[PDB]
Design a protein around this ligand. Structure first.
Ligand SMILES: CC(=O)O[C@H]1C(=O)[C@@]2(C)[C@H]([C@H](OC(=O)c3ccccc3)[C@]3(O)C[C@H](OC(=O)[C@H](O)[C@@H](NC(=O)c4ccccc4)c4ccccc4)C(C)=C1C3(C)C)[C@]1(OC(C)=O)CO[C@@H]1C[C@@H]2O
Ligand SMILES: Nc1nc2c(ncn2[C@@H]2O[C@H](COP(=O)(O)OP(=O)(O)OP(=O)(O)O)[C@@H](O)[C@H]2O)c(=O)[nH]1
Ligand SMILES: Nc1nc2c(ncn2[C@@H]2O[C@H](COP(=O)(O)OP(=O)(O)OP(=O)(O)O)[C@@H](O)[C@H]2O)c(=O)[nH]1
Ligand SMILES: Nc1nc2c(ncn2[C@@H]2O[C@H](COP(=O)(O)OP(=O)(O)O)[C@@H](O)[C@H]2O)c(=O)[nH]1
Ligand SMILES: [Mg+2]
Ligand SMILES: [Mg+2]
Lengths: 429, 91, 441, 441
């Protein structure tokens, strides 16, 4: 069966990843010690996907952790699930990146990529057949932007035929937690156009919006932004792990969802998101999930979807459903929104229906959509970039680590060609 | 070829910018109760075997200009125009 | 493990080192005789973190500190006080005479022949550490050893260590109140090696902290004990991410990447939120939007410097304690709306938030008390250029009269050194006039 | 069982023998009256090892020591002190007059007719031992009997014993401080038989141990009691592998194989790690990487000699106590990285580690205390050649004036002996100029 390797780079990466392997564990019914104590027998058939076996009935995730520069080491180890990862996988060095790209890709990345890929190959050959290389990294930072895209330059090189999904947390128009941030996005999108099959554009503002405009949370901590990301991360590989009525791999999505090989920057949604105790004033049905998925205040990429045409979308439904209400709710949205889609594609939406819900819910979904409205996430950075680069503002912390000025103009030429190949299909014809 | 040629490259460009009117022997002498003499020695033989850049420009008979390799705040090299007036500026 | 080497220099540097190491010993639990009887009750945790404390096998803890002052009078307070047995007994005194307030006795006369003990002691101290280094230098401008001897200590540590980060925390001469008449001579000669070697120079001042100790703290007679604790609270939350467990930690290398646009404009003008009294510890909410708005008014800058007459370039909000990361962005979109808080065109990102969540502790003996959160904003503005022009003017007013200068050139230094230090500060002030002005098309 | 014969000569040799045999009696448990009441409590173990101690049937123990000084004044301290009844009562005094600081009274006049008691006493002492022999000679250069009488004792023991290893531990005249004005004459005449007969000559000095007793030990007034204990700690860990149970023992024949490249460059310049105070016995980790790096700085060499102005040839790190053999190689790959610690081309191996794991003990009465490990590095460098040129220069400055020489030639010695000892030291200094210089192709 089909098996996935999960890689975690940048300090944003394992913080999502530590919450990621808690959602996966409770979805399979697996304790902190890896002992299976699940309810049914239906969740052992694809433990093989994420958890390879161990000696006595214990399960270990195939989780490489590149990002444990030692400030994060003894919190992930001294966490809820520090007794579940294999301790040889904790690959790191000393003197972390420093919110620097060139100290992730050229200087400290080159003296660590050999120690990572010696564990990547030891986790590939313990598998029957691989397809998946999930990389949870973030743009903007250090390790997650230079070293996160150094491995994709190497892992795609040693595996030219694997589906490479990178759940890439992106910068924001207002929330600026990094001063150098328009450099670590331009230099990393230049790598993630060439070297990935799909990559999910997630922002913190549209995660800050849902925890206030929809979930009504008083103080959304960083755990409650990762608990929303991870509910999508276990929503793309649901049909891999669980039986269904219309299955969808990580490749039936990434053949349908992508028209042209550069147009693979996705915005993920999730439903049902709502705020309650145990008294909520609604009814979980198939037309109830549909309106919330397509709603412009339940994206995650923090762009306005009604500014552009959706190229094609994928609605990975879960739970027990009826396929007529699935195929007819996906029809009426496409007709009411005839300008909001691309006219010159026959049917835009595809459907994927699994048969096992989450633990507490009755039904759920995942809106993965490829839109031209993500032109706004790349135009804002390319305006912030050429403002900093015109003065040659922060460049002596990068050219003092080995780079050249003629790699900066290479990176802005590539991002400006995505905006050209998004403004085209946003226009009508 | 030479490693330090660039600093001297702007020096060779500055020597065509202004008008060279140097000091020739046989000019008139004014009163000048307090004189200040400044003499430049010629280039020795050890200096050309060491890659030496002449940085002492003598444009007038009362003015002498010295250049200095500096940089901007964008690591961009330029020449500072140290402008001195003597009485008596010699070649 | 990541670590720092705290090198205090001068009397200003050692007097601040009385209270920086008084604060560290109380947070981690270390008594004034090296032991840790606090964590022996629980029985776990390595809280005497190896950032600041070497550990020996007998349970005693030794700091990473070395300090040189060329006068026995200052360090003999340390060698007889409460912190006698804590430090290693190589606290380098050996000065048969004080510097006498000049840069020439100083960089040349008696700073040489004592520096041979200094560099070898750092090499005996740096080679016990694996990982990050950073030299936390402590001195003052204007003095003799804080200006002269630091200048010799930088050009001899930018060669034996190369590219290591050097955070030096200088006390700058105030434009109105000066405790020496030759202090404008020393604080222009020390810039020629602060600009070149030390990558990041935190300037604070004595008059701008006098007003904070009178207005907010409501202390009518603040001695030097009560000023050095406020610098100690700042220095703690600069190097707090190297120790404690935060939600967004900021390493000492992450300062260099963010705070410093150009290699010669590294002067970032620290602040704090010290509105504790502690009578006014009640009567006041002190939320995230409250303590972030303390940097708005120019009555809370630590330097006598008006930020409203200049741009900003890059800021670094560093929090402590019970901070939720959502409340921060409410207190930042507010600041980017206010039109007198003025940025440049070429930095649209602005800020950077480091949320450590260990609360700042209280030194017993006054003068503030237990607040639940704090902030140490670090922002290199363009406004520091007018803080230097009120010091180049003090230099130029007594350089035409050739005052005080026979004790500078009659100690080995040439008289041409002064105009070499003027042509930097004239050109370094010229750099701030270009960076703040945007380009038009 | 392997054993040594410790032959002290002179007043310097006997005064060191006061404290070398004070140290041995405390490690093994032997009281100053021969008994062993320490191991009688346990009831087992032969710890009064036969390396240094002959055992008689009545439980008493007798050392392997004989010492000759040609003056009763020194040995009458031993014959009336605390160690009166310990030694055998043949401590050879018999000198009706002191040597009076010359080599000619000396090798010729009164050293002869007393040597007949000496060699027969060694034969009565060497024929009680089966196995390894080694003559631990103790003298000083510069003196009369330490230079003259040792020179007669070497050419009369290189014939009756042949090829036995002779470790002689000479105190060398300091280049700046000399306690005699004729000491440059004696320390050039004693080289003509040290070079030929004694296979390995450990040179130490008095000025370089004065600085160690002032800087590290922090003793302001070090008498000769406190200097001879530091040589005694060195001499213990030279002959420690012959007694105690180690993980890599180094025999006295293993010195000759390793330390000595050529038959005439045997001068290896011992060191130690005496940074105990014992106030500074705290405040300091003293790991394997710490005590191995004590040999880096030239402020811890036992000879006034700068190793940075010369190559090394071969070193011999000899450890004591709680040493793990893994930690050693970390402290050696470090040293082979440092570019001022300079080797020759023709010795790429470098080092040799002898790990004994018995800790060095503490003589009660000061001045250091119980450290957990130690090191006695023995390294013949090229730098000892500049320590001799500052002694040939003292010889040549008063050889042109024909000073002091009528008391040398008027005691049997010919005046041609001086230039025969100059043509060695000129040619022996010439040997160190060739060995340090590598060959090019
Ligand atoms: C009584 C009842 O029905 O309670 C629900 C509930 O009230 C609501 C509000 C839940 C609740 O979720 C949140 O409040 C929340 C907190 C942080 C981040 C994201 C969400 C719930 O906590 C979450 C919890 O979710 C699950 O049990 C899923 O299996 C979910 N699990 C986790 O995220 C998880 C949490 C802790 C430990 C381990 C796993 C999941 C979703 C996708 C993929 C895998 C797992 C559910 C249904 C509920 C509560 C308990 C109140 C909601 O969320 C989810 C993920 O279901 C929020 O909006 C939905 C709608 C639910 O009805
Ligand atoms: N905040 C603070 N400032 C101090 C302290 N001691 C001195 N200063 C200031 O430092 C400046 C004087 O420099 P000092 O550090 O006293 O001088 P020094 O470094 O010992 O140099 P010399 O005495 O000249 O050899 C003045 O501006 C003082 O106000 C202190 O303990 N705290
Ligand atoms: N370390 C140490 N050095 C000593 C001692 N006694 C003498 N010296 C040194 O030895 C040298 C003098 O030689 P001595 O041993 O005193 O002379 P001697 O061998 O008795 O010879 P004569 O008296 O000349 O017959 C000087 O350099 C002294 O400093 C001692 O007990 N310890
Ligand atoms: N969702 C989420 N975002 C984070 C987390 N930690 C940091 N970030 C974001 O990640 C970016 C900073 O990069 P970070 O991962 O901390 O830097 P790195 O360690 O150099 O990769 C900013 O946009 C932060 O808002 C986290 O735990 N969750
Ligand atoms: Mg002073
Ligand atoms: Mg004598």
């Amino acid at each position: 069966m089909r098996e996935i390797v999960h890689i975690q780079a940048g300090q944003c990466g394992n913080q999502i990843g530590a919450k990621f392997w808690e959602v996966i564990s409770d979805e399979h019914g697996i304790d902190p010690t890896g002992s299976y104590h699940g309810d049914s027998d239906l969740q052992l058939e694809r433990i093989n996907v994420y958890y390879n076996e161990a000696t006595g009935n214990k399960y270990v995730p195939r989780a490489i952790l590149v990002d444990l520069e030692p400030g994060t080491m003894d919190s992930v180890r001294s966490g809820p699930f520090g007794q579940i990862f294999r301790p040889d996988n904790f690959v790191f060095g000393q003197s972390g990146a420093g919110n620097n790209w060139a100290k992730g890709h050229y200087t400290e990345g080159a003296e660590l990529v050999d120690s990572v890929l010696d564990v990547v190959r030891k986790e590939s050959e313990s598998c029957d057949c691989l397809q998946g290389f999930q990389l949870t990294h973030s743009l903007g930072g250090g390790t997650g932007s230079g070293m996160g895209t150094l491995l994709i330059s190497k892992i795609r090189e040693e595996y030219p035929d694997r589906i490479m999904n990178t759940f890439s947390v992106m910068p924001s128009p207002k929330v600026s937690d990094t001063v150098v941030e328009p450099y670590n996005a331009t230099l990393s999108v230049h790598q993630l156009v060439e070297n990935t099959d799909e990559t999910y554009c997630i922002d913190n503002e549209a995660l800050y919006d849902i925890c206030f405009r929809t979930l009504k949370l008083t103080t959304p901590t960083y755990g409650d932004l990762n608990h929303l990301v991870s509910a999508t991360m276990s929503g793309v590989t649901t049909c891999l792990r669980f039986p269904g009525q219309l299955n969808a791999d990580l490749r039936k999505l990434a053949v349908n969802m992508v028209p042209f090989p550069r147009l693979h920057f996705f915005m993920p949604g999730f439903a049902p998101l709502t705020s309650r105790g145990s008294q909520q004033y609604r009814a979980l049905t198939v037309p109830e999930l549909t309106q919330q998925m397509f709603d412009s205040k339940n994206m995650m990429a923090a762009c306005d979807p009604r500014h552009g045409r959706y190229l094609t979308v994928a609605a990975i439904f879960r739970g027990r459903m009826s396929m007529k209400e699935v195929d007819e709710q996906m029809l009426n949205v496409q007709n009411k929104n005839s300008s909001y889609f691309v006219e010159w594609i026959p049917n835009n939406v595809k459907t994927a229906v699994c048969d096992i819900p989450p633990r507490g819910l009755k039904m759920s979904a995942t809106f993965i959509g490829n839109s031209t409205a993500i032109q706004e996430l790349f135009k804002r950075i390319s305006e912030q970039f050429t403002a900093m680069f015109r003065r040659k503002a922060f460049l002596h912390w990068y050219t003092g680590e080995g780079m050249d000025e003629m790699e900066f103009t290479e990176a802005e030429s590539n991002m400006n060609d995505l905006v050209s190949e998004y403004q085209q299909y946003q226009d009508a014809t | 070829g030479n490693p330090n040629w660039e600093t001297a490259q702007m020096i060779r460009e500055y020597q065509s910018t202004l008008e060279f009117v140097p000091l020739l022997d046989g000019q008139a002498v004014d009163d000048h109760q307090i004189t200040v003499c400044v003499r430049k020695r010629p280039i020795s033989r050890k200096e050309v075997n060491r890659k030496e850049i002449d940085v002492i420009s003598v444009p007038r008979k009362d003015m002498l200009i010295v250049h200095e390799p500096r940089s901007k705040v964008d690591l961009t090299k330029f020449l500072e125009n140290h402008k001195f007036r003597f009485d008596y500026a010699f070649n | 493990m990541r670590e720092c080497i705290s090198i205090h220099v001068g009397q200003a540097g050692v007097q601040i080192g009385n209270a920086c190491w008084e604060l560290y010993c109380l947070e981690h639990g270390i008594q004034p005789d090296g032991q840790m009887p606090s964590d022996k009750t629980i029985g776990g945790g390595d809280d005497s973190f190896n950032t600041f404390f070497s550990e020996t096998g007998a349970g005693k803890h030794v700091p990473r500190a070395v300090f040189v002052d060329l006068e026995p009078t200052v360090i003999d307070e340390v060698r007889t006080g409460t912190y006698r047995q804590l430090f290693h007994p190589e606290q380098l005194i050996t000065g048969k005479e004080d510097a006498a307030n000049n840069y020439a006795r100083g960089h040349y006369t008696i700073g040489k022949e004592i520096i041979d003990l200094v560099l070898d002691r750092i090499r005996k101290l740096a080679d016990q550490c694996t990982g990050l280094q950073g030299f936390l230098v402590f001195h003052s401008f204007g003095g003799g050893t804080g200006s002269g001897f630091t200048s010799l200590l930088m050009e001899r540590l930018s060669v034996d260590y190369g590219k290591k980060s050097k955070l030096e925390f200088s006390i700058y001469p105030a434009p109105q109140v000066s405790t020496a008449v030759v202090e404008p001579y020393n604080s222009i000669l020390t810039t020629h090696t602060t600009l070149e070697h030390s990558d990041c120079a935190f300037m604070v001042d004595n008059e701008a902290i006098y007003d904070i100790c009178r207005r907010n703290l409501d202390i009518e007679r603040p001695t030097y004990t009560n000023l050095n604790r406020l610098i100690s609270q700042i220095v703690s939350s600069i190097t707090a991410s190297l120790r404690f467990d935060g939600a967004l930690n900021v390493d000492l290398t992450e300062f260099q990447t963010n705070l410093v646009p150009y290699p010669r404009i590294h002067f970032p003008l620290a602040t704090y939120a010290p509105v504790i009294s502690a009578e006014k510890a009640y009567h006041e909410q002190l939320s995230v939007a409250e303590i972030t708005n303390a940097c708005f008014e120019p009555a809370n800058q630590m330097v006598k410097c008006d930020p409203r007459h200049g741009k900003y370039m890059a800021c670094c909000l560093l929090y402590r304690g019970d901070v939720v990361p959502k409340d921060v962005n409410a207190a930042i979109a507010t600041i980017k709306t206010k039109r007198s808080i003025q940025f440049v065109d070429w930095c649209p990102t602005g800020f950077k938030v480091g949320i450590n969540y260990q609360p700042p502790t209280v030194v017993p003996g006054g003068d503030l008390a237990k607040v639940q959160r704090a902030v140490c904003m670090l922002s290199n503005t363009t406004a520091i250029a007018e803080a230097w022009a009120r010091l180049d003017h003090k230099f130029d007013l007594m350089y035409a009269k050739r005052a005080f200068v026979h004790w500078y050139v009659g100690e080995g230094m040439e008289e041409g050194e002064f105009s070499e230090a003027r042509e930097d500060m004239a050109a370094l002030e010229k750099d701030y006039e270009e960076v703040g002005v945007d380009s038009v098309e």
